[PDB]
Amino acid sequence: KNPKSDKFKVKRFHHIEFWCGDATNVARRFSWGLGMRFSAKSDLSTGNMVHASYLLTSGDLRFLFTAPYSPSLSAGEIKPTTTASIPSFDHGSCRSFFSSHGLGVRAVAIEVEDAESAFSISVANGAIPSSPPIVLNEAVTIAEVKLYGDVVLRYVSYKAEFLPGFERVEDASSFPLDYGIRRLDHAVGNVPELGPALTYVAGFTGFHQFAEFESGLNSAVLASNDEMVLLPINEPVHGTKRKSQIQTYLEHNEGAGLQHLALMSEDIFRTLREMRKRSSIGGFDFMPSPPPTYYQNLKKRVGDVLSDDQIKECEELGILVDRDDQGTLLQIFTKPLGDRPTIFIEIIQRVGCMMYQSGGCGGFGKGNFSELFKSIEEYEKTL
Amino acid sequence: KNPKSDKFKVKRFHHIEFWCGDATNVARRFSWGLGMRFSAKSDLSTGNMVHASYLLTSGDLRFLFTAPYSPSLSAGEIKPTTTASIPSFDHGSCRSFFSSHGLGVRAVAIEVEDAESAFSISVANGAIPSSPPIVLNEAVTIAEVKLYGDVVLRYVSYKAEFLPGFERVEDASSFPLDYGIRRLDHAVGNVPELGPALTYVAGFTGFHQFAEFESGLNSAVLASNDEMVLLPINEPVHGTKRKSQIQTYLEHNEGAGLQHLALMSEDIFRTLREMRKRSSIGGFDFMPSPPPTYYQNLKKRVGDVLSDDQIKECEELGILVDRDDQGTLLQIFTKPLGDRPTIFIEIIQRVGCMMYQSGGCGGFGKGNFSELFKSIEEYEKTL
């Protein structure tokens, strides 16, 4: 059931912005680890005396990395005279965010028809304003409201590359890396209390609950009208034998924030081969693979969707598989992206629900908790 | 002339410590860009609730990357009960350093015979104490005094891998990268006033001035008894046509700090081939190469040291060449390591002064300023 209750016209995920202490080193690490190209910049070389911002792209996926310069470089400026290309940026907010949370997502940006309208309707419907609508070069409008913790939902609308004031990156500095990642599938937040978080966000967006089918969490997924913008939210389950990973996140992150980004691949096998080649040479590590009992149990569950060779290829790469009543998904999770056990990345590919592919085809893999537990004691018994 | 006036026994450079906002991403970028292996760690997985520290090695070169965790993880601790592996670490100092300077060197560490003695004699001779001597696991002693800006000179002495509380990194996570870098040759500071900086440091170390042979700077080099610990210091020259790069550093760094690290290669041609292959895929960029007039002028200056092919190989890689009355050096400079135009790296190889090779063989390349200017207008005229 999809009531299509969006209070304003939402298009697609537009970009994700990381707040960094040094944007250069994070962007270069991510570029190599994920196979994303350097595509735009806004920094001292483009006249920006306020912040350094570097944009990586792979397909339609856009990762922005931003860090503050010394405030002394821009001490003469006022907001009317700012050289910042992102007017919502604030030195104090950025430094406070990174010292509080470490490396993490500041903004989940979605493209909308009219960012000023989206902002007004959101705030009229309970959203906490973060940055009012600002029109950039009479061409693009940006506005921000609080999502959870210190994460903002950023509205972007275009009258008609990335943002005014950003320059395209020269070919010499722009190596065409590509490991197959194509777009952001969903972005997941961790909060202490799911109920009030859901009520707040569904309250100001009109996003509806996306239907699903003791793992340490309770979850729910908010979705736009065509279910292409997907925002899951988790809360911890306390008292459990194993401590909730949601609680660990909240402790090390100093509260609520973005837990993981799920990146759709057009060929998850190629993506994982390329990423795993680079894990120990600057890229990303992956969670430990499931036991072979898990892959021995895959024939009975998805043997009609994946060949034996394709299942063996999942085993080689540590890929997980789950299935809806309507589709199948392949997924795998990285280890945390930075020092703290907080944000990580999921790589995903979805099989089915063809019409284009409908959003969320196959679900989000919640069945992989019990299957993993089931594989673990089975492999212990086989030993 | 070398008076050998060291006030305590100094051995070699031991390590360089970067203070980071996220040590993981910087260490992974540097590892790939410079061909350094992950060799030790101290972090949550080793019981350290205070800071994340990752050690990269190439030959005898040791780069340490450290960032703070949330203070809440260690709020119950006191210094007697600390889980920090580096007792001088302070959350507030680290956050203040990185917000003030961005990514940069906090500590230049030298190995000494007796770190407590080195500390006492230094402070008795004018050094500003930063962290008193602390004995780690009855095995290693560490102490720190101020060097310039917020950079400390760290004394390490061993009674008898890296530091107690660090664990060696597992083979799977430790890929044996190596592009030929072997040790730290020198570490250079920028200050507003050279005179008082020299008087202070030579005052408490007994380091002597290393003899040399309008570029925007005045410089002098302090050296230990065997001239293997080399600490150059620069001040800006104001009024010049082109603005001093030393002044630009001081402005963007918010004052004095470490300007560049010079890393000796056992084969600078291999090192530069390997680094340049990776510049646009996560590694380091290099300054723009000199005009071919520079290499056309190399035959007359070093044609007795380098063959024509070896000179052509310098041209392919953008390497610079300078010569003493006693030796020749090959050198090249990276672009800044992070967002700000502050710290960069120099790769160097020295030819001559065999006895082992004596320190500073060939000088530091100060002659390359006039040669570069001379190449530039010559190439303009040839056009």
Ligand SMILES: Cc1nn(C)c(O)c1C(=O)c1ccc2nnn(Cc3ccc(F)cc3)c(=O)c2c1C
């Ligand atoms: C649920 C779920 N609900 N919604 C809306 C989602 O998007 C999801 C997921 O993506 C999903 C699905 C299956 C999984 N199976 N195992 N693990 C183990 C683990 C990995 C990294 C850690 F730091 C700690 C534990 C997972 O994390 C896991 C996730 C995170």
Ligand SMILES: Cc1nn(C)c(O)c1C(=O)c1ccc2nnn(Cc3ccc(F)cc3)c(=O)c2c1C
């Ligand atoms: C001097 C000197 N004295 N001592 C004790 C040293 O160690 C040195 C050097 O290493 C040395 C030698 C020759 C050079 N020729 N050209 N450039 C251009 C440039 C590069 C990066 C920038 F951000 C701005 C300008 C240099 O920097 C340069 C250096 C830095």
Ligand SMILES: [Co+2]
């Ligand atoms: Co997910």
Ligand SMILES: [Co+2]
């Ligand atoms: Co130098």
